[PDB]
Amino acid sequence: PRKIEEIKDFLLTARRKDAKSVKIKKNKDNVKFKVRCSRYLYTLVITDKEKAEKLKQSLPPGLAVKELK
């Protein structure tokens, strides 16, 4: 697993051809975006909430999204 700490490289890895699916985990105080690539699983952690759901529509349309309920 690899943690992504700045905002934009997460989208950069998300738009790679290798990427399979992104799953959204919504626990208290954190929001985790997990993108599954061939080699690693990249996790981006957002502390607040508003960045999270204004990014939720910024993922590429062709990439599968799964909300963990």
Partner RNA sequence: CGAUGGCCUCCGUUGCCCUCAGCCGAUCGAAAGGGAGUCGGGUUCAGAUCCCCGAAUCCGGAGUGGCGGAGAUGGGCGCCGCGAGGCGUCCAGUGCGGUAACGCGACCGAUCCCGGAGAAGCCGGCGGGAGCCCCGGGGAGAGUUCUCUUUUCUUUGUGAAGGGCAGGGCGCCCUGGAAUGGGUUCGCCCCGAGAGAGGGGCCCGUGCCUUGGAAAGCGUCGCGGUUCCGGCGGCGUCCGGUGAGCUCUCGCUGGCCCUUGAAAAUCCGGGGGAGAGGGUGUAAAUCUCGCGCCGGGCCGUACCCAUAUCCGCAGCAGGUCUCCAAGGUGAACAGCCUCUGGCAUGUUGGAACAAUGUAGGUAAGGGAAGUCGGCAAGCCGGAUCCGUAACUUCGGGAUAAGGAUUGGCUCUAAGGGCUGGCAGCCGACUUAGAACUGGUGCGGACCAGGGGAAUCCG
Q: What is the strand order of the sheet 21-27 is part of?
A: 2-4, 41-46, 30-36, 21-27, 64-68
Quick one: 61 exposed, middle or buried, by C-beta within 10 A (0-12, 13-18, 19+)? exposed
Q: In the complex with RNA, which residue's Cβ is closer, 32 or 56?
A: 32
Q: In the complex with RNA, which residue's Cβ is closer, 15 or 58?
A: 15
Binding pattern for the stretch 25-64 against RNA, x by CB under 7 A and - elsewhere: x-x--x-x-x-xxxxxx-x-x-------------------
- 16, two tokens: 């790679």
Residues forming contacts to RNA in the complex (CB under 7 A) are 1-3, 16, 18, 23, 25, 27, 30, 32, 34, 36-41, 43, 45, 68-69
